[PDB]
Ligand binder design. Structure first.
Ligand SMILES: Nc1ncnc2c1ncn2[C@@H]1O[C@H](COP(=O)(O)OP(=O)(O)O)[C@@H](O)[C@H]1O
Ligand SMILES: Nc1ncnc2c1ncn2[C@@H]1O[C@H](COP(=O)(O)OP(=O)(O)O)[C@@H](O)[C@H]1O
Ligand SMILES: [Mg+2]
Ligand SMILES: [Mg+2]
Lengths: 521, 527
C-alpha cells in the first residue's frame, strides 16, 4: 500500500470471467462477416476517417477495414490473413468455424473443466478430420489435356459464384484459365496486368495476349509520327535521350572562342550519335524508362518512328517478357537478338484514355486484363473477385484434388466424428461430439442467407448422409438438397484442409490463456 | 461473469451503424432525391441550373454530368450516381441525365417488391434478364444510314437533335454545320477514330454569338514582336524554330577565361558575328516569316525588322505542333539544319484587332489540305461562352459516335416505349416469380415519356397511353411524344435521331449500377 508493485494504471483480469469475455468477443467478430457467405450473400460498406468508402464482400478485406483492438479478437483477423496468404480463398469460413468451436465449448469451460482436456480433444478431432478428407478426396491420375481444363473451369466458376460478377462467371472463367495457362512454371502473379478504364459495360472487359499500357507524357511533335505498325522491331532502353550536362561532377575551362564553339557543337554531336545508333539498328518502336526529349521526339517523328518515355518498370518488364528482348543501358551493341518483335502495334482510344497495344506475339509468357465498369469501387471489387479465381486456379494447377461443396464435406466429417465419438468413454466423448456438432454451421448459414427452413434441410441432409450420397449438399435454386458432385460444385481439398488446421489452432490458443495484463498508455 | 461494456472497436462510442432493410430504404431515398433533382432538365423544354462555386463563381448549365460534378454531397449513394454520370460522359458523351433518371426510377420501382418479401438477388436477376431482352430488341429496330463527306444531311440532323436542348438553339443549324464539318475534316476513316487534340476550341467575350465560326488553320493570342512590322502576309513561308535567337550556351558547367585585351576584342567581335550569321542563315532559305518558341534579343529583333521578315515570339509547344501540322512544315532545333524543304506554306497570315482594348490575335488561314481546325466562339457573356463550349463538345462527341458506328434509332421516347412493350410481352412466358421483376423493369423504363410530357406541359398518363395504343395498333415503333407541338407523333418524319450505342450504354450502365446498389445491406461510418 505505501509502495505498490506495478505502475498505476495497470489492469488485470483472471479466471473464468475473462475467458468467457474472450468467447463473447469472438462471437461479435464472427457476426461482423456472417451475412456474406454463399451465392445469396450480401456485401458491406465501410467509411474511414477521410471519407473514402470501400464496398466489399471479402472477409479478409472487411476484417482488415474494421479497427479491432481486442487482444482475443485479433486472432480471428490473423487467421483470416493467414488463409488469404496461403490459399487465397475461404476467409469467412475459417472465422465462422473458430467462433462456432468457441461457442460450443463455452458451457464446459463454465462447468470448471480444465482447458487442456478441451485442447487435446480439439487436436485429436482436427487430425482425424484432415486424414478423412485426404482419404475421401477425388483425383484423376492421367485424365487428359482437355479434362485438365474443365476441372479448372469448374473450380473457377464455383469460386466466382458468390461475387459481384456472378452473372458473367462463364465469361470470366475462360479468361482466367487462359491467363494462368499462359504463365511460365513459377506462376508469378506480377506477370499478369490488371487495368481499369472507366465507362463501358462489364461484358466489354477483354484479355490481350501481349501487352497494353497507358499513354505517358509527350512533348511537341508526338502527333506527327505514325500510330500503327504491322511488323515492327522494338528497342527497350534504360538510357536518357535528351540534351543535358554529361556529369554533375563536370566543369569546362576554355580559353578561345573557337574551342568554345567546338564545345557547343560536341553535345549535339553526342546526342545525334546516340540517335543514329538507335536508328541504324532497324527498330521502329522505342521505349525508355527515362525522359525522351523534344529534340529526340522530333528526330524520331521526322523518320516515321514511334518513341515513348517514362514507361513504368513493371510494364517494361512485362513487355520484354512478351516480346523477347532485353533492357539495354548502352546503345553501342544494339544487335538483332536484343530487339523485340510483335505482330502488330497500335494506339487506341478507350473510354477517354489513350492506350498502347502490342499484340500478336505467340511466344508470350504474359497477358493483360482490361476491365470496364461504372465506378472506381465497381472495378476494385471486380479485381478482388478476379484475384480469388486466379489463386484457386494456381493451386489447382499445382495439385488437382477436388471435393464437392455446399456442405457435403462438412456433413460427412460431422458424421464421421460422431461415429468415432461413440467408441471412446469419458469427457472425450462429449468434447468430440461438440466438435462434430460445430461443423454444420456452414450449411445452416447458407440456408439462413438464402431464406430457407434450415432445420428441415439439415434433418434431411443428416438422414441422407447416414443411410449410406457422400456428396450431398443444399440446392439454392431448388429449395432442397441435391448431389453437388454431379451438379459441378467443386473446390480443391486445400481450402478445407487449411481451414480446419487454421481454425483449430486459433481456438486452442484462445482457450489456453489464463489472465490478461495491460500496461499504461 | 458480468459482461460489462467491453471495448472491441477503436472509437466504439462515436461510430454508428445501419443494417437490414433500413439501409436499403435510405439508399433508395437518396437515389430518389438525386433523380428528382435531375428530372426537370430533360428534353427540349427543360430548364437549367445555376451553381455557385466555393469562391463565389457562377455557372449556368444544363449538363447533368457538370451539375453532378459541381454538387458536393455526403451520401455514398449520391457519390455513386455522380460517378455513374461521369462514366457515361467519358464513354459516350451524351445522355448523361437520362441514365441517372432511369436508375432512380428503377431503384424506386424495386421498393414495392422489397416490401412484398422478395430477396434482392432475385430482383437483380430479373433486372438482368429484362435488360438483356431489351438490348436484344433494340438493335432489331435500328436503321443504318451513312458516313461520307458528300451527303452530310443525316449527320446534320443528328447534331441538330443533340443541340436542340441547349441555349444555343437560336443558331443550332449553324453550329451543327460547324461541328459536322470540323469532325469530317479531322477524322481518320480507315482506322475509324478522331483525335480531339487536333480540334482547338477558343472563345473571346464580345460581339455576337452568330459570329462564331470555323477556321481551317490556327488562331493564337500573340502578335508581331516589333511594333513597326507589317500586319499581314499573303504568301507566307513559315520557318518554325525551337531555339532562342541568342548566342549558344553549353548546358554543362563552363567558364570562358579572358586574360588579355586581344581576347576581349575577339569575344566582342564573336558576339555580333553570331547575331549576323543566324539572320543570314534564316534569310538564305527564302523564308518570309519566322516563328520561335522562345524570346529574341534587341539586336535580333532589329535585324529581323531590317531584313523585311516578320517574326512571332514566345509561342507554346501545342501551338507549334498544330501550326506545323496545318502548314505542312517541320520543327527544326538549329539554324544550321534549316532548309527550304522544311518550310510551311500558308495562304494568309493576319493580325486581328478587337474593340477598345489593346488585345490582338494572330490568324493563319488558307492552307492546303489541313488536319487541324479551330472553332472561334463569340458571345456577350462568359457563361454564354462556357455553355457554347459544352454544347459544341456534345455535338462533336455525338458525331464521333456516328463515325464509330453508323446505325441509329428514333428519339422522343419511341425506343423506350417499344422496349417496354417487348419486355412486357416477354414477361408473360416466365413463370418462376421473376415476372414481377420483369414488369417492374417495364414500368420503370417508361419514365422518360412521363418526364418529357410533364416538362412540355401535357398530361403524362393520357399521352403515353394513347401513344402506346397507336404503336400496338399500327406497326410503327417510330412514334413518340410531340414535345414541340408540330401536330405529329412521327419522329422519323420530324427528323429526331439518336445513336444506338448511346441507348445501349444507358441501359446497361444503369442496370449494373442498380444491381450494385441493391446488393449492399450494411453501412458503418463515424459520427
Ligand atoms: N453454386 C453453389 N451452390 C451451393 N453452395 C455454394 C455454391 N457456390 C458456392 N457455394 C458455397 O459457398 C461457400 C463459399 O463462400 P464465399 O462467400 O464464396 O467465400 P468463402 O469461400 O470465403 O466462404 C462454400 O462453402 C460453398 O460450399
Ligand atoms: N425535338 C425533340 N422532340 C422530341 N424529343 C426530343 C427532341 N429533342 C430531344 N428530345 C429528347 O430529349 C431527351 C433528353 O435529351 P437532353 O435533354 O438533350 O439531355 P440528354 O441528351 O443528356 O438526355 C432525349 O432522350 C431526346 O429523345
Ligand atoms: Mg469464398
Ligand atoms: Mg443530350
Amino acid at each position: 500500500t505505501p509502495v505498490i508493485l506495478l505502475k498505476e494504471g495497470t489492469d488485470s483480469s483472471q479466471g473464468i470471467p475473462q475467458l468467457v469475455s474472450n468467447i463473447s468477443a469472438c462471437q461479435v467478430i464472427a457476426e461482423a462477416v456472417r451475412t456474406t457467405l454463399g451465392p445469396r450473400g450480401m456485401d458491406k460498406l465501410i467509411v474511414d476517417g477521410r471519407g473514402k468508402a470501400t464496398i466489399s464482400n471479402d472477409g479478409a478485406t472487411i476484417l482488415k477495414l474494421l479497427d479491432v483492438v481486442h487482444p482475443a479478437a485479433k486472432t480471428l483477423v490473423d487467421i483470416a490473413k493467414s488463409q488469404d496468404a496461403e490459399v487465397g480463398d475461404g476467409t469467412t469460413s475459417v472465422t465462422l468455424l473458430a467462433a462456432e468451436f468457441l461457442k460450443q465449448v463455452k458451457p464446459y469451460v463454465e462447468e470448471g473443466l480444465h482447458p487442456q482436456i478441451i485442447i487435446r480433444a480439439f487436436r485429436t478431432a482436427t487430425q482425424l478430420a484432415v486424414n478423412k478428407i485426404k482419404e475421401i478426396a477425388v483425383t484423376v491420375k492421367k485424365a487428359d489435356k482437355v479434362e485438365q481444363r474443365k476441372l479448372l473451369e469448374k473450380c473457377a466458376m464455383t469460386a466466382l459464384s458468390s461475387k459481384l460478377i456472378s452473372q458473367q462467371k462463364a465469361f470470366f472463367a475462360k479468361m482466367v484459365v487462359d491467363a494462368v495457362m499462359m504463365l511460365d512454371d513459377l506462376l508469378q502473379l506480377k506477370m499478369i496486368g490488371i487495368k481499369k478504364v472507366q465507362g463501358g459495360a462489364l461484358e466489354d472487359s477483354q484479355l490481350v495476349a501481349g501487352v497494353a499500357f497507358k499513354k505517358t507524357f509527350s512533348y511537341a511533335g508526338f502527333e506527327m509520327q505514325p500510330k500503327k505498325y504491322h511488323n515492327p522491331k522494338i528497342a527497350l532502353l534504360n538510357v536518357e535521350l535528351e540534351l543535358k550536362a554529361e556529369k554533375d561532377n563536370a566543369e569546362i575551362r576554355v580559353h578561345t572562342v573557337e574551342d568554345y564553339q567546338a564545345i557547343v557543337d560536341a553535345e549535339w554531336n553526342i546526342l545525334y550519335d546516340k540517335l543514329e545508333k538507335i536508328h541504324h539498328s532497324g527498330a521502329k518502336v522505342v521505349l525508355s524508362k527515362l525522359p525522351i526529349g523534344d529534340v529526340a521526339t522530333q528526330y524520331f517523328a521526322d523518320r516515321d518512328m514511334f518513341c515513348a518515355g517514362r514507361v513504368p518498370e513493371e510494364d517494361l518488364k512485362r513487355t520484354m517478357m512478351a516480346c523477347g528482348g532485353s533492357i539495354q543501358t548502352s546503345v553501342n551493341a544494339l544487335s538483332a537478338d536484343v530487339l523485340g518483335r510483335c505482330q502488330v502495334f497500335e494506339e487506341t482510344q478507350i473510354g477517354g484514355e489513350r492506350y498502347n497495344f502490342f499484340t500478336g506475339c505467340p511466344k508470350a509468357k504474359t497477358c493483360t486484363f482490361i476491365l470496364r465498369g461504372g465506378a472506381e469501387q465497381f472495378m476494385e471489387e471486380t479485381e478482388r473477385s478476379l484475384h480469388d479465381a486466379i489463386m484457386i486456379v494456381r493451386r489447382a494447377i499445382k495439385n488437382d484434388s477436388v471435393v464437392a461443396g455446399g456442405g457435403a464435406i462438412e456433413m460427412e466429417l460431422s458424421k464421421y466424428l460422431r461415429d468415432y465419438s461413440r467408441t471412446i468413454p469419458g469427457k472425450q466423448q462429449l468434447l468430440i461430439g461438440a466438435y462434430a456438432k460445430a461443423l454444420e454451421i456452414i450449411p445452416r448459414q447458407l440456408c439462413d442467407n438464402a431464406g430457407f427452413d434450415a432445420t428441415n434441410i439439415l434433418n434431411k441432409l443428416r438422414a441422407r448422409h447416414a443411410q449410406g450420397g457422400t456428396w450431398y449438399g443444399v440446392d439454392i435454386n431448388n429449395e432442397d438438397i441435391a448431389d453437388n458432385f454431379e451438379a459441378f460444385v467443386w473446390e480443391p481439398a486445400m481450402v478445407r484442409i487449411n481451414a480446419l488446421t487454421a481454425a483449430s489452432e486459433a481456438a486452442c490458443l484462445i482457450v489456453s490463456v489464463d489472465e490478461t495484463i495491460k500496461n499504461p498508455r | 461473469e458480468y459482461g460489462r461494456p467491453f471495448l472491441i472497436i477503436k472509437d466504439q462510442d462515436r461510430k454508428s451503424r445501419l443494417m437490414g432493410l433500413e439501409a436499403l430504404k435510405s439508399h433508395i431515398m437518396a437515389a430518389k432525391a438525386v433523380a428528382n433533382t435531375m428530372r426537370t432538365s430533360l428534353g427540349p423544354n427543360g430548364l437549367d441550373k445555376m451553381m455557385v462555386d466555393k469562391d463565389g463563381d457562377v455557372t449556368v448549365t444544363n449538363d447533368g454530368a457538370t451539375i453532378l460534378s459541381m454538387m458536393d454531397v455526403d451520401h455514398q449513394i449520391a457519390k455513386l450516381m455522380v460517378e455513374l454520370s461521369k462514366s457515361q460522359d467519358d464513354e459516350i458523351g451524351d445522355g448523361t441525365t437520362g441514365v441517372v433518371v432511369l436508375a432512380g426510377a428503377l431503384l424506386e420501382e424495386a421498393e414495392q417488391l422489397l416490401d412484398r418479401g422478395i430477396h434482392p438477388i432475385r430482383i437483380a436477376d430479373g433486372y438482368e434478364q429484362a435488360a438483356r431482352v431489351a438490348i436484344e430488341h433494340l438493335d432489331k429496330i435500328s436503321d443504318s444510314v451513312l458516313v461520307d463527306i458528300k451527303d452530310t444531311e443525316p449527320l446534320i440532323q443528328t447534331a441538330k437533335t443533340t443541340l436542340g436542348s441547349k441555349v444555343v438553339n437560336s443558331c443550332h443549324r449553324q453550329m451543327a454545320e460547324i461541328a459536322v464539318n470540323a469532325v469530317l475534316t479531322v477524322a481518320d476513316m480507315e482506322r475509324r477514330d478522331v483525335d480531339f487534340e487536333l480540334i482547338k476550341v477558343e472563345g473571346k467575350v464580345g460581339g455576337r454569338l452568330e459570329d462564331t465560326k470555323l477556321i481551317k488553320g490556327v488562331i493564337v493570342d500573340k502578335d508581331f514582336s516589333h511594333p513597326q512590322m507589317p500586319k499581314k502576309v499573303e504568301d507566307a513561308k513559315i520557318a518554325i524554330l525551337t531555339c532562342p535567337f541568342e548566342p549558344p550556351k553549353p548546358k554543362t558547367k563552363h567558364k570562358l577565361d579572358v586574360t588579355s585585351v586581344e581576347d576581349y576584342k575577339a569575344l566582342q567581335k564573336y558576339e555580333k558575328e553570331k547575331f549576323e550569321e543566324m539572320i543570314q542563315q534564316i534569310k538564305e532559305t527564302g523564308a518570309n516569316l519566322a516563328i520561335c518558341q522562345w524570346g529574341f534579343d534587341d539586336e535580333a529583333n532589329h535585324l529581323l525588322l531590317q531584313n523585311n521578315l516578320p517574326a512571332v515570339r514566345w509561342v507554346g509547344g501545342p501551338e507549334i505542333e498544330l501550326i506545323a501540322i496545318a502548314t505542312g512544315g517541320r520543327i527544326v532545333p538549329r539554324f544550321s539544319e534549316l532548309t527550304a524543304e522544311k518550310l510551311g506554306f500558308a495562304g494568309l497570315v493576319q493580325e486581328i484587332s478587337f474593340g477598345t482594348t489593346k488585345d490582338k490575335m494572330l490568324v493563319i488561314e488558307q492552307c492546303k489540305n489541313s488536319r487541324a481546325v479551330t472553332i472561334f466562339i463569340r458571345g456577350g457573356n462568359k457563361m454564354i461562352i462556357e455553355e457554347a463550349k459544352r454544347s459544341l463538345h456534345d455535338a462533336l462527341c455525338v458525331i464521333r459516335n456516328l463515325i464509330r458506328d453508323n446505325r441509329v434509332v428514333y428519339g422522343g421516347g419511341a425506343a423506350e416505349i417499344s422496349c417496354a412493350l417487348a419486355v412486357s410481352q416477354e414477361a408473360d412466358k416466365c413463370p418462376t416469380l421473376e415476372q414481377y421483376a420483369m414488369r417492374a423493369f417495364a414500368d420503370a423504363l417508361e419514365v422518360i415519356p412521363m418526364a418529357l410530357s410533364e416538362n412540355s406541359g401535357m398530361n403524362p398518363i393520357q399521352t403515353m397511353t394513347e401513344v402506346r395504343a397507336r404503336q400496338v395498333k399500327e406497326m410503327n415503333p417510330a412514334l413518340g411524344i410531340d414535345c414541340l407541338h408540330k401536330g405529329t407523333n412521327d419522329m422519323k418524319q420530324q427528323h429526331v435521331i439518336e445513336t444506338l450505342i448511346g441507348k445501349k450504354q444507358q441501359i446497361s450502365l444503369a442496370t449494373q449500377m442498380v444491381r450494385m446498389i441493391l446488393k449492399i445491406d450494411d453501412i458503418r461510418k463515424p459520427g
